[PDB]
């Protein structure tokens, strides 16, 4: 695939440069922050922040005029996503013609415009009304393919979403200059990030688009809710996929999931931090298969989360051997205690992770409505460790996410 790359913006020796071999000029204006979350990323957060790319014009005398692909990841803040306005983000229109990428009312839009100012567009609603099921402030992978013989096509995370006919446009005059940046007035919380920006001189196959996607998602790296690398020490609101409006609370010596008082907020209560059981550095990336512990600062004391030794059902008398369900508890004695060591893994194939323990029996963490106190028949939404979990490996009840306080999603805690 890389053989057809005619532009590849990557961070080399602490600079954003073109590594394609064609040595495009890459000039940064304003105060563009680079390599803040991912190596090849850059942030557009102010009206003056611009990256100006000038390609060697001779590149345009090639298959690029007949077929091309553009790929990159993008992450758009909540406040920018919420705006009804239109913002040009990547501009390669000169003299009435070329292409551009815009954001408008929670959509991304790719525009191709001919020499008569007639244009065609691909539009994707990434916001879904700021739904937590949507992509607001989440990294997603974009790929546009263009073929003058037919269509331009928009792929999101490797999947075709939209197509538009372009064979009926008149001449398109491409320009050698690409300008990244927002010219409109934007508020302090309005910002976006792009990473791994590439242009190819061919129309990539579906298979090849997915190879680029899987390469660049970094399957080794567990992700937070937004698609950023998960890190040791960082505070996260840990949630089960099924219960995004609940927080983890100790109640009568176990942990349960309690609904936060403001149902519309992601940043709730009692964030956890993740610690390495293998002595990795503070704030280092958490990798697929890493052995970890969970800490929680609660009422001014630091605790570690442990699995209960006995199941939630008193009649099992500590002798359960199949379909065993264990509550989670807080322990004030901190250390590499086996009962509190877990393994974290990305979900085979399918920004969620699964969490396992191999202390005494193999278990997997899930959340469901149980009666988690041995002395009681009271029901609670409960995070539990269960054995014999083969049939639950595709259940969303086994999927966990970690919400960091991210600058692209701002909230203020009520009193």
Note the topology:
Layout: E1 5-12, E2 15-18, E3 25-29, E4 33-34, E5 41-44, E6 50-54, E7 67-76, H1 78-81, E8 86-94, E9 97-104, E10 107-113, E11 119-125, E12 140-147, E13 151-156, E14 159-165, E15 177-180, E16 192-200, H2 206-216, E17 237-240, E18 246-251, E19 254-259, E20 272-276, E21 291-298, E22 301-307, E23 325-331, E24 342-346, E25 353-357, E26 363-370, E27 380-386, E28 400-403
Antiparallel strand pairs: 1-2, 1-16, 3-6, 4-5, 5-16, 6-15, 7-12, 7-16, 8-9, 8-15, 9-10, 10-11, 12-13, 13-14, 17-28, 18-19, 20-21, 21-22, 21-24, 22-23, 23-27, 24-25, 25-26, 26-27
PDB class: toxin
Keywords: Structural Genomics, Seattle Structural Genomics Center for Infectious Disease, ssgcid, botulinum Neurotoxin, receptor binding domain, ganglioside, phosphatidylethanolamine, mosaic serotype, toxin
Assembly: monomeric
Question: Outline of this structure?
Answer:
The chain is mainly β and 415 residues long. Helix content is 4%, strand content 42%. It is elongated.
CATH architectural label of the largest domain: Sandwich
Q: Provide the CATH topology of the largest domain.
A: Jelly Rolls
**What gap, in angstroms, lies between the N and C termini?**
54 Å
CA-based shape: elongated
N-to-C order of helices and strands: EEEEEEEHEEEEEEEEEHEEEEEEEEEEEE
Using only C-alpha atoms, the radius of gyration works out to 24 Å
Number of strands: 28
Question: In percent, how much strand structure appears in the residues?
Answer: 35-45%
CATH class categorisation of the largest domain: Mainly Beta
Number of domains: 2
Structural class: mainly beta
Largest sheet, strands/sense/barrel:
9 strands, antiparallel
Question: What is the helix content?
Answer: under 10%
Our count of helices gives 2
Family: Belongs to the peptidase M27 family.
Protein name: C/D mosaic neurotoxin
Disulfide bonds: 320-324
Domain Clostridium neurotoxin receptor-binding C-terminal: 213-410
